[PDB]
Ligand SMILES: O=C(O)[C@@H](CO)OP(=O)(O)O
Ligand SMILES: O=C(O)[C@@H](CO)OP(=O)(O)O
């Protein structure tokens with residue numbers, strides 16, 4: 111019983127970037143108090159660990175987290191008092207067993223994750239290390255790299271009234287030489303995009319979505335991609351910025367007919383029937399985009415359980431980074447399935463989707479051992495917490511998507527990444543290297 | 550000793566709009582204290598000016614590498630070894646080091662970052678939370694949780710709609726504590742979002758710089774109707790009031806002395822009565838007030854239309870009339886308003902003056918006159934929560950720091966909740982906005 115021992119655990123309800131309640135957890139040791147805030151997704155894969163919400167329709171539209179907070183204060187916290195914060199896997203497993211359900215739906219994945227993260231922060235202080243460095247040592251990473259940031263810039267799918275099927279288009283400065291330059295390139299390109307959008311779609315078209323990007327009324331993906339090429343060109347960075355696409359294809363998939371409708375939002379009398387695609391037709395569409403635009407990466411190109419489609423795309427078009435999101439939900443068992451089936455070559459990491467840091471590390475290890483890409487990710491409902499910045503560096507993931515360069519729940523991560531780079535001095539930048547290893 | 554400045558270091562970060570700003574770290578025996586500075590003006594006639602690089606090829610000329618260099622190589626060395634507890638002495642030292650009235654040599658941004666981090670280091674030296682240290686420093690024996698006022702609808706230069714005014718805010722003056730105030734506003738905002746989607750479409754729920762919506766309304770009445778509807782849907786009629794920021798300088802014609810409430814309306818669709826003289830404008834404001842629960846009006850007239858401000862304040866002595874552009878957090882402008890009886894409330898934007906010491910003085914002047922005092926965000930904010938501790942410790946009783954949306958806004962509201970939780974019994978301002986010396 112010493113400085114490393116938990117003396118106090120306390121949670122409270124705060125508001126996330128969308129203005130909905132979420133939880134923050136504070137853990138106190140001899141090194142001080144350590145705070146973590148938990149994010150939350152606007153739309154969530156059917157397989158995620160589950161956040162506990164109050165369901166009281168008279169309070170915050172039923173989205174309160176008083177129950178999760180009490181769970182921390184009167185259940186998890188009491189069980190953590192006196193324990194050693196250095197024992198990350200032991201404490202995470204203890205909370206998993208308290209809950210007793212595979213989806214963490216009893217105590218709430220949000221309650222558990224908040225404790226998991228603050229335990230980790232307290233431990234880094236105990237070792238006298240910055241968080242990213244503690245994360246590296248905890249996970250056996252002898253090398254660290256600044257990740258390529260991918261910035262949401264144009265929205266579609268369920269997030270916009272435009273005709274655009276895909277959920278988002280991102281810009282990724284793979285050609286930058288360091289992180290502060292990468293951020294500057296994206297910020298400049300984002301401002302050029304804002305100008306182009308204002309001129310073409312009007313002032314109000316530059317108001318922003320949840321993640322800081324724009325939702326102009328484009329006719330489809332080609333018009334959206336043209337806008338990105340135009341902005342990158344105005345910024346002067348052609349050939350140094352690439353494009354990532356998140357299709358979120360489950361959103362426009364018809365399980366019964368096996369069809370993907372790229373015109374779901376288009377009025378019948380204006381709807382090209384060619385927009386309703388079978389897998390081969392959807393594949394050809396993606397390949398066409400790839401031929402005409404610098405698209406490096408495609409996330410959720412097919413529905414969350416269309417394994418055959420994922421496999422075909424992966425072995426027949428492996429030149430793309432192919433990212434499982436809704437497919438994998440940061441869940442090691444899903445990752446194992448995807449590896450056996452050879453269904454993708456990259457995984458998105460959303461910590462709150464699995465609910466503990468220990469399980470997150472395992473997901474990342476599996477991916478890195480296979481040489482898959484690993485992209486740390488924000489949620490639509492973010493907070494002023496910067497944890498994932500340290501996580502992406504410490505675990506050497508090499509990619510992060512955490513928002514447009516707009517809205518501070520996004521900038522706070524990018525600012526932290528710049529600090530980490532400044533502090534390290536001679537840390538390399540990932541550039542066009544996305545595939546991971548366990549080194 | 551642990552009070553002595555051992556290290557001063559600044560770097561360039563991005564603000565909530567994606568533009569560069571500065572953050573400053575000061576290290577003492579108590580640890581490292583970081584402050585982020587919100588973005589402000591680099592030009593203008595009365596306010597302190599931030600320093601920008603003006604390199605067109607970098608961040609569109611908006612870099613702050615020069616301000617950063619000023620902190621690291623000029624202000625920092627002048628601070629080394631100094632006692633953080635001496636706020637006024639250090640602020641005055643920096644003011645003299647810059648040597649210009651508007652801090653334009655070193656930059657108000659460079660100076661303020663230092664001022665704030667000195668203050669945080671001092672609070673730690675005294676073993677106090679920031680808000681409490683601030684109260685002690687400024688002689689406030691009583692603290693109050695402020696009424697938060699939240700941006701909800703945008704007009705003027707911030708929207709393509711016909712709405713003349715820059716923004717409407719909602720203010721939960723009928724809440725009983727701060728946690729409840731925030732919830733009321735969050736619920737109302739979500740209700741408004743639903744209403745706007747139904748009436749104007751999904752894309753009309755995308756948000757502006759401060760988290761509010763820009764629905765294509767025809768004018769003030771349509772906007773006010775949406776707010777009253779949202780408030781009723783949330784179930785808080787009579788407990789939420791409306792603040793109107795006209796930013797009237799935006800639609801003032803200096804040659805004709807007219808205020809055009811239809812600047813954005815095409816000539817052939819335009820009601821001719823929309824172009825008003827001062828009396829006509831006053832009449833319009835009075836009419837909104839008769840039909841809607843409007844509790845305050847910010848910049849109702851142009852930034853130098855003293856006669857109009859005085860006329861309005863005299864004819865409505867009891868009603869909150871807030872100076873923003875009129876005053877720019879500037880003690881000399883505040884004094885002029887007091888001499889002319891031009892208004893009865895002041896916005897406080899710390900970066901518009903540049904040091905905490907001068908900020909304390911502007912607030913003190915207003916409190917001695919029984920004026921309203923409203924701590925305010927900037928359009929380009931950061932993840933820094935300083936103004937939350939500031940508004941509580943200085944007993945200002947009002948704060949406007951965004952819609953309940955975008956974390957550069959929520960981080961302040963979240964911090965305000967923490968302060969209330971920590972204090973326990975602290976009163977909520979409610980309908981009491983006029984400050985006092987108590
Ligand atoms: O959908 C996504 O990929 C991400 C944000 O880019 O998260 P979310 O689930 O919360 O929307
Ligand atoms: O326009 C304004 O009146 C205010 C509102 O926050 O500030 P700024 O200059 O930051 O825009």
Ligand SMILES: [Mg+2]
Nearest residue numbers: 356358410435
């Ligand atoms: Mg996705």
Ligand SMILES: [Mg+2]
Nearest residue numbers: 794796847873
């Ligand atoms: Mg204003």
